[PDB]
């Protein structure tokens, strides 16, 4: 079996973009901060800890638009007890057609890899957006790299990436551009 079911019909003809969570769209920590966009309770061995989450700038603009252009899929090496609530709060527009977490990654050479082969899509019509090149080692030609984000409220990288994505959204074969 594959990780995703068939694309639902309005998505059939779209490129499938796999999008990472931490350091890509948000940055989270257990260290209290005052300006967290979200605070999430996470239970670890019977103790409830608080996770403070900051939104990367332009994340809302970015997701709303990607959600129109692609079949967007959340794929993260983090556990659902963290990632799933954050996606609930982050994803106002329903951009994410599916969510995959740590158990859907492949553990390989000490790293949790996003094995794009396991989605069940044509890789000529798959992209991955992930801040950590280790996450896509099996498919480095499917990637749009993006810098790691932590707290720079000046970051404009998700904004500045939209034009590139618009123009990818049109093509038949993503490799025709990334090679």
């Amino acid at each position: 079996q594959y990780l995703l079911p068939e694309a639902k019909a309005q998505d059939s003809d779209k490129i499938c973009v796999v999008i990472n969570l931490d350091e890509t769209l948000v940055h989270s920590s257990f260290k209290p901060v005052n300006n967290a966009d979200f605070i999430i309770p996470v239970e670890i061995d019977g103790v409830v800890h608080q996770v403070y989450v900051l939104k990367r700038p332009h994340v809302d603009e970015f997701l709303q638009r990607m959600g129109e252009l692609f079949e967007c899929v959340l794929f993260t090496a983090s556990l659902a007890k963290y990632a799933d609530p954050v996606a609930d709060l982050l994803d106002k527009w329903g951009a994410f057609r599916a969510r995959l977490f740590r158990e859907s990654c492949v553990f390989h050479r000490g790293n949790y890899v996003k094995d794009l082969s396991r989605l069940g899509r044509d890789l000529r019509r798959v992209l991955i957006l992930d801040n950590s090149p280790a996450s896509y080692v099996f498919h480095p030609d499917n990637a749009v790299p993006v810098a790691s984000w932590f707290d720079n409220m000046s970051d404009t990288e998700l904004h500045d990436l939209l034009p590139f994505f618009e123009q990818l959204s049109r093509v038949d074969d993503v490799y025709s551009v990334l090679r």
Binding site: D22, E23, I44, V51, K81, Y82
Partner: peptide, 4 residues
């Protein structure tokens, strides 16, 4: 860590 439950994150990354």
């Amino acid at each position: 860590s439950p994150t990354x």
